[PDB]
Amino acid sequence: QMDEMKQTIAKQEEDLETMTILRAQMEVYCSDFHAERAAREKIHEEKEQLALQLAVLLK
Amino acid sequence: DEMKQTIAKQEEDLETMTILRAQMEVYCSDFHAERAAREKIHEEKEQLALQLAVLLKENDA
Amino acid sequence: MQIFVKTLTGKTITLEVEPSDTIENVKAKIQDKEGIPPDQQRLIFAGKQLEDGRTLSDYNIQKESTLHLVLRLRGGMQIFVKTLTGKTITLEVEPSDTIENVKAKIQDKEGIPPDQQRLIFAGKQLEDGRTLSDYNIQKESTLHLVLRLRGGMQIFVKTLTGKTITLEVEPSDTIENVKAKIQDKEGIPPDQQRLIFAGKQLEDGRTLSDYNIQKESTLHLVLRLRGGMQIFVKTLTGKTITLEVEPSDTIENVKAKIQDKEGIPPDQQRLIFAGKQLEDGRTLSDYNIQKESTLHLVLRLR
């Protein structure tokens, strides 16, 4: 009548909360990408303004 | 004895774990791809701006 | 079996053991039944000085026979705790004692509850689970005692990389303050930290009370791939690299982050920003250096 089930449930409870931490860590990696894309998008826009000034150098 | 009520259901919810870890890895390298792209653009900006400095400087000699 | 132990105060405590045991490991059974270390214990029965480890059945000791316990006033090691009143108290310790053990003895002498106790040795606060030998606390050392105030508590922060760190906090403290204390301990800038308790993301601006965060609570720490401010550096080759920085980063701080990426020793780096040379003792902020500013890297040839 041994209940190391308690020990293996308790080993699952940790693993479960770890998952939610993993999940939250995944969400954070997701929002970072977006900030990075917005950063890439902003510097591309800056690159496009130099390119314009080059294109327009005669008139 | 109904311990088995949970110990088995635990493993099915914990299946999801490695799908998160794999998705973590992907979002990670996706992030590095964007920052790489931004770096490249930063370099292209320097070439354009060098192009402009040279055209203007040599228009005035 | 079952043998009795009578001090001269008449008190009789009783536990079970077998005749194979020796004098030495019985004292260890005495220490966790009412609380006396083994370097303060000396056992007598029938005028035969029981000496630390000739077999019990060598002295002819049978069940139900009563032993006589004598107690030293003194163990082998004393330390001193200085209070903020200027009162200094004297503790009986062993190097194996945990800071929580030491805290219990402070409660015993002075009534101060352990969760209200903070102990400092050599400018360093000592953590509940480590021993006196871990901190090199030797005979006759002085610890300093500081009480927690205003609901003050310790809490724990855990990363996925296993690390579990301990923090000294108050309920009025904000999430930003907690992150700053995490920075002070771990180097991690706060704009790269997110904190989880229960399953809520903890918002900057709210306090520990707001999230109902009580003593010895555990927060989880998750790290961002990027903060809020990046600058660009130009390599010796001529590639752009990106640095996670803060305006309070020093120039030595920035050079180290370059070593991590380009492997160039800091004493060999020279950093230019719009003509000017960046000096070591200085910060990004002092130079008017913004997000997405570009620096140039040149060697010093030393």
Author numbering:
A (entry chain B): 443 to 501
B (entry chain C): 445 to 505
C (entry chain A): 1 to 302
How did the manuscript describe this experimental structure?
To clarify the molecular mechanism of linear ubiquitin recognition by OPTN, we crystallized the human OPTN CC2-UBAN region (residues 416–510) in complex with linear tetraubiquitin and determined the complex structure at 2.7 Å. The asymmetric unit contained four OPTN CC2-UBAN monomers, which form two parallel coiled-coil dimer structures, and two tetraubiquitin molecules. Although we used the OPTN CC2-UBAN region for crystallization experiments, the electron density for the majority of the CC2 region in all OPTN molecules was very weak and thus we modelled only the UBAN motif with some extensions on both sides (residues 445–505 for the longest chain). In the crystal, the third and fourth ubiquitin moieties of tetraubiquitin bind to one side of OPTN-UBAN in the same asymmetric unit, whereas the first and second ubiquitin moieties bind to the other side of OPTN-UBAN in the adjacent cell. Thus, there are two OPTN–diubiquitin complexes, composed of one OPTN dimer and two diubiquitins, in the asymmetric unit. The UBAN domain structure of OPTN·diubiquitin superimposed well on that of NEMO-UBAN·linear diubiquitin, with a root-mean square deviation of 0.72 Å for 62 Cα atoms. OPTN-UBAN binds to diubiquitin in a similar manner to that observed in the structure of the NEMO-UBAN·linear diubiquitin complex rather than that in the NEMO-UBAN·K63 diubiquitin complex. The distal ubiquitin is recognized mainly by hydrophobic interactions, with additional polar interactions. In contrast, the proximal ubiquitin is recognized mainly by hydrogen bonding. The Glu478 side chain in OPTN hydrogen bonds with the Arg74 side chain, near the linkage of the linear ubiquitin chain, in the distal ubiquitin.
Optineurin (OPTN, also called FIP2 and NRP) and A20-binding IκB proteins contain a UBAN domain11. OPTN consists of multiple domains, such as leucine zipper, LC3-interacting region (LIR), two coiled-coil (CC1 and CC2), UBAN and Npl4-type zinc finger. Unlike NEMO, OPTN does not interact with IKKα and IKKβ13; however, OPTN suppresses NF-κB activity by competing with NEMO function. Thus, we concluded that OPTN functions as a linear ubiquitin-binding protein through its UBAN domain, and that linearly ubiquitinated proteins, such as RIP1 and NEMO, are important candidates of OPTN-binding.
